[PDB]
């Protein structure tokens, strides 16, 4: 009928407004498009990947350009502890004059936004110093984006179109990605650190016009080629070194000091260089594992077929799994998302405790924003990983080709897995909520000594084994005569033990009963989100209520009111339910991070230690207490620069609430309402001169779940971002 969903004639012949919505929502599900083949599917995905890479490089170019043009990067470089970094300028014609005055910050000549992304600390650490450096980087990245766009166009041309078998050559791709994309990139980064970033940290101005003239080490490359590699570790930067200057600097380029630079409170750059060099060698070696065209290397199908326990404990083992993984893009995407999202969480956990950028640890707003940002990104990615696992089970799983292997066998005891996840979720919820409520009642009745405060002795024992002597467990790195102690004593242990025994950093924070309770809340959240996702994936193909669910696909509204009623029976609906639990879980995690760090940054650890053991403590001493500056961003007396966060705070509350409408009220109410509206327009004079092209209808059942979830999530994120940034930046 129409030609907009040109990939779907079924949508194109829809006479209602549903055609537009579904045309948008199905545009990137290339496998379900009309007349698609496997080869054309892979080629379209390859080009789309080029487009995404170009978008990423353009985004980075824009950040560099706006900081270079409108920021205060040289001024921040001069005084990194007393200059608020500027993100970009504000040109808003709706501003009143008090808003123009309030937002003028950081030494800017006009209203600006203060950055929370940490790009100043990162770019300063890696050696950038001037606006010209940032501009040149931005121009280079714009050119890189243009190159990626050209390559995406080019490999869609018929003579440059890669064959389907090229996409399924797993061994060559793994060899090249491990050796070059990981290893050579890390080696080149070590080159940048040694030639540029380390000299710039020592006051030496090294750029493209003089780096062939500048010696990175006084003895050149002779210690490298002779194998006398300990020369490069001699004479590190002293503990009195001032970053960016030659005062107190050394000449070492590859060290293993451990711990932090005393002034910047961040990792030593020479340690970072040695890290990336060792990583480069390990990854280049690992990229020579798989067989390509030279008669040596492993064959992955035979590796998988060989790994079956001879006692039969895993049935057929991993037999046939090579073709299962290699033929399913959803299996590959599920694996990629699970691993990348776990890595994103690892980045969040390691960047707060081991800050890698100079003057990042002292920037409290930036640290809180980065932790929260990456943990929410990690949560969304993990939900997607399990979603595409469910999609694999529906669309790509062939039971005959996987007969008796580990995949079929875990499908064969899915009730055991789901029921045990249910048990652990129930145990954690019952007992964590019960201990919190008991403590709340104890505080309410005036008897806090009757609280149940369980000491986290296992994690404290771990902290002791890594050298924290506060808890009195004398073992390993906290035992001065142990073998583990003596082995590291001349290499990384002095700096590490200085850092881990200081309470002025975030390295292995002191923990107590509040940390116990919130960690068990986190365990409850992880296990329940996993339960919903895993039950969705394992029941995706069918259940007792709907034994032919695979015939209906990943996403469908329901199977009607029969058989007791079947709302939210699809695996997609399990994803939709699990997003709520993921948001809840990351909320608990980030609440914990922010409140514990708020106490640490304000120099009062007793507030978290005493109030976090009961939930009124969380409400009153975290949410209520820290919202005071935020909600006074504008008031009857006037406004300040926090008024944008007050407005966005309310904006997020509104969007969150609007989502409840789509989630609570369901379709048929709105369809009858829209029918009366369609009657009204046709019968109204001067208005019935105009007519709709698409028949107005209520949003579909699944679309409503999506739109409600999107409003809920966006309001969740916007509200917490406003509260986090306003509460931290109004104090710091």
């Amino acid at each position: 009928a129409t030609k907009f969903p040109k990939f779907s004639q079924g949508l194109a012949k829809d006479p209602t407004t549903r055609r537009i919505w579904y045309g948008i929502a199905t545009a990137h599900d290339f496998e379900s498009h009309d007349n698609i083949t496997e080869e054309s599917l892979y080629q379209k995905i390859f080009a789309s990947h080029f487009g995404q890479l170009a978008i990423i490089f353009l985004w980075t170019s824009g950040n560099l350009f706006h900081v270079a043009w409108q920021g205060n990067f040289p001024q921040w470089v001069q005084d990194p502890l007393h200059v608020r970094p500027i993100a970009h300028a504000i040109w808003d014609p709706h501003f009143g004059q008090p808003a123009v005055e309030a937002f003028t910050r950081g030494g800017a000549q006009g209203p600006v936004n203060i950055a929370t992304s940490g790009v100043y600390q990162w770019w300063y650490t890696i050696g950038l110093r001037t606006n010209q450096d940032l501009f040149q980087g931005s121009v280079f990245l714009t050119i890189l984006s243009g190159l990626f766009l050209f390559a995406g166009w080019l490999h869609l041309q018929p003579r440059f179109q890669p064959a389907l078998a090229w996409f399924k050559n797993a061994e060559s791709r793994l060899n090249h990605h491990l050796s070059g994309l990981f290893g050579v990139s890390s080696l080149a980064w070590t080159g940048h650190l040694v030639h540029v970033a380390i000299p710039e940290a020592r006051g030496q101005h090294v750029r493209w016009d003089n780096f062939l003239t500048t010696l990175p080490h006084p003895q050149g490359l002779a210690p490298f080629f002779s194998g006398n590699w300990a020369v490069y570790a001699q004479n590190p930067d002293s503990s009195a070194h001032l970053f960016g200057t030659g005062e107190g600097s050394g000449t070492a380029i590859l060290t293993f000091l451990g711990g932090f630079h005393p002034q910047t409170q961040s990792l030593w750059l020479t340690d970072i260089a040695h890290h990336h060099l060792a990583i480069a060698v390990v990854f280049i070696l690992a990229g020579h594992m798989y067989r390509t065209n030279f008669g040596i290397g492993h064959t992955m199908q035979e590796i998988l077929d060989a790994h079956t326990p001879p006692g039969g404990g895993l049935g057929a083992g991993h037999k046939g799994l090579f073709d299962t993984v290699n033929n399913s893009l959803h299996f590959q995407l599920g694996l990629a998302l699970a691993s990348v999202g776990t890595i994103t969480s690892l980045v969040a956990q390691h960047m707060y405790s081991l800050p890698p950028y100079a003057f990042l640890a002292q920037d409290f707003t930036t640290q809180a924003s980065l932790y929260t940002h990456h943990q929410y990104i990690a949560g969304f990615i993990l939900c997607g990983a399990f979603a595409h696992g469910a999609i694999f089970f529906v669309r790509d799983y062939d039971p005959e080709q996987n007969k008796g292997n580990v995949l079929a066998r875990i499908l064969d005891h899915k009730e055991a897995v789901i029921s045990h996840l249910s048990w652990v979720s129930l145990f954690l919820g019952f007992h964590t909520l019960g201990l919190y409520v008991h403590n709340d009642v104890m505080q309410a009745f005036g008897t806090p000594e009757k609280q149940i405060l369980i000491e986290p002795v296992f994690a404290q024992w771990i902290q002791a084994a890594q050298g924290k002597t506060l808890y009195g467990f004398d073992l390993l790195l906290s035992q001065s005569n142990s073998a583990a102690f003596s082995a590291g004593q001349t290499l990384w242990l002095p700096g590490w033990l200085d850092a881990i025994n200081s309470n002025s950093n975030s390295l292995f924070l002191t923990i107590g009963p509040g940390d116990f309770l919130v960690h068990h809340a986190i365990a409850l959240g992880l296990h329940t989100t996993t339960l919903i996702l895993v039950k969705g994936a394992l029941d995706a193909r069918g259940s007792k209520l709907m034994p032919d669910k695979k015939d209906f696909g990943y996403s469908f509204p329901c199977d009607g009111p029969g058989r007791g009623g079947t709302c939210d029976i699809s695996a997609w609906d399990a994803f939709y339910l699990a997003v709520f639990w993921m948001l809840n879980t990351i909320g608990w995690v980030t609440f914990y991070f922010h409140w514990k760090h708020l106490g640490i940054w304000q120099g009062n650890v007793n507030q978290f230690n005493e109030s976090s053991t009961y939930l009124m403590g969380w409400l009153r001493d975290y949410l209520w207490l820290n919202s005071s500056q935020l909600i006074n961003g504008y008031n009857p007396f006037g406004m300040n620069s926090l008024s944008v966060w007050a407005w966005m705070f309310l904006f997020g509350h509104l969007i969150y609430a609007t989502g409840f409408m789509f989630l609570i009220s369901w379709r048929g109410y709105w369809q009858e309402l829209i029918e009366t509206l369609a009657w009204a327009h046709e019968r109204t004079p001067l208005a019935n001169l105009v007519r709709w092209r698409d028949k107005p209808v209520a949003l579909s059942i699944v679309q409503a779940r999506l739109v409600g979830l999107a409003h809920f999530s966006a309001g969740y994120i916007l509200t917490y971002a406003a509260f986090l940034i306003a509460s931290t930046s109004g104090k710091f």
Partner: protein, 31 residues
């Protein structure tokens, strides 16, 4: 030291070329 007007115009021109290449890729992906 601030950027010059010419540097901003250079960046905008290179971005316009990149945008033309982007429109080309988007149309090729479409049909």
């Amino acid at each position: 030291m601030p950027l010059s007007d010419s540097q901003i115009f250079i960046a905008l021109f290179i971005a316009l070329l990149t945008g033309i290449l982007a429109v080309r890729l988007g149309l090729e992906l479409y049909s």
